[PDB]
């Protein structure tokens, strides 16, 4: 309950800043079908384009019974694979705050 | 029987992302800049011209003597 203030710190530290934005825009523009023929896994995927993940097309355990969304960035550079990770941490807080309400007592 | 899951007491914290604390934008800026800048120029002409008055006063003592 006291973590989203800490992720709102780095938003002020890096997102709205210009120099770090100027330090990383249009660097590593790899977006073609050789960005998938190289056999990449996620981010340095879908945040560059092609929507696919192993987190709601393939189940693990009770993992589909929770609600969340998956981030997609705009172009195929590092700054649009950086902005996956800010929204990705804004998903794990929801899932933990969704998982605690649903645990039954039982065995190990 | 002594397992975890509590009956109640939940938030959550937000997934939200906002802090628009602006901030005197939109032509309110450039207005405190120009007026205070000319205020510094307004502080001139009352000191340099004043020191210029003392500058002729300083050269006055040189010319009055030296015969």
UniProtKB/Swiss-Prot annotation, chain A:
It comes from the Eukaryota. One of its GO terms (cellular component) is mitochondrial inner membrane. [4Fe-4S] cluster binds at residues 78, 84, 99. Core subunit of respiratory chain NADH dehydrogenase (Complex I) which is composed of 45 different subunits. Component of the iron-sulfur (IP) fragment of the enzyme. Interacts with NDUFAF3. Interacts with NDUFAF7. Interacts with CERS2. One of its GO terms (molecular function) is metal ion binding. It comes from Bos taurus (Bovine). Core subunit of the mitochondrial membrane respiratory chain NADH dehydrogenase (Complex I) which catalyzes electron transfer from NADH through the respiratory chain, using ubiquinone as an electron acceptor. Essential for the catalytic activity and assembly of complex I. Redox-sensitive, critical component of the oxygen-sensing pathway in the pulmonary vasculature which plays a key role in acute pulmonary oxygen-sensing and hypoxic pulmonary vasoconstriction. Plays an important role in carotid body sensing of hypoxia. One of its GO terms (biological process) is mitochondrial respiratory chain complex I assembly. The keyword Nuclease does not apply. The chain holds residues 249 to 356 of 463 of the full protein. Its main location: mitochondrion. Belongs to the complex I 49 kDa subunit family. This is NADH dehydrogenase [ubiquinone] iron-sulfur protein 2, mitochondrial. Keywords: 4Fe-4S, Acetylation, Electron transport, Iron, Iron-sulfur, Membrane, Metal-binding, Methylation, Mitochondrion, Mitochondrion inner membrane, NAD, Oxidoreductase, Respiratory chain, Transit peptide, Translocase, Transport, Ubiquinone. The keyword Transmembrane helix does not apply. The gene is NDUFS2.
UniProtKB/Swiss-Prot annotation, chain B:
It is found in: Mitochondrion inner membrane; Nucleus. It comes from the Eukaryota. The chain crosses the membrane at residues 24-45. Disulfide bonds: none annotated. Accessory subunit of the mitochondrial membrane respiratory chain NADH dehydrogenase (Complex I), that is believed not to be involved in catalysis. Complex I functions in the transfer of electrons from NADH to the respiratory chain. The immediate electron acceptor for the enzyme is believed to be ubiquinone. Involved in the interferon/all-trans-retinoic acid (IFN/RA) induced cell death. This apoptotic activity is inhibited by interaction with viral IRF1. Prevents the transactivation of STAT3 target genes. Complex I is composed of 45 different subunits. Interacts with CARD15, but not with CARD4. Interacts with STAT3, but not with STAT1, STAT2 and STAT5A. Interacts with OLFM4. Belongs to the complex I NDUFA13 subunit family. This is NADH dehydrogenase [ubiquinone] 1 alpha subcomplex subunit 13.
């Amino acid at each position: 309950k006291n973590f989203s203030l800490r992720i709102d710190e780095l938003e002020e530290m890096l997102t709205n800043n210009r120099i770090w934005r100027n330090r990383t825009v249009d660097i590593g523009i790899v977006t073609a079908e050789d960005a998938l023929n190289y056999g990449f896994s996620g981010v340095m995927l879908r945040g560059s384009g092609i929507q696919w993940d192993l987190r709601k097309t393939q189940p693990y355990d009770v993992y589909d019974q929770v609600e969340f969304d998956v981030p997609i960035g705009s172009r195929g550079d590092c700054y649009d694979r950086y902005l996956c990770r800010v929204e990705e941490m804004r998903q794990s807080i929801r899932i933990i705050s969704q998982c605690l309400n649903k645990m039954p007592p039982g065995e190990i | 029987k002594q397992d975890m899951p509590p009956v109640g007491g939940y938030g959550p914290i937000d997934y939200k992302r906002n802090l628009p604390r602006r901030g005197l934008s939109g032509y309110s800026m450039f207005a405190v800049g120009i007026g205070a800048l000319l205020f510094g120029y307004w502080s001139m002409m009352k000191w340099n011209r004043e020191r210029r008055r003392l500058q002729i006063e300083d050269f006055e003592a040189r010319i009055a003597l030296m015969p």
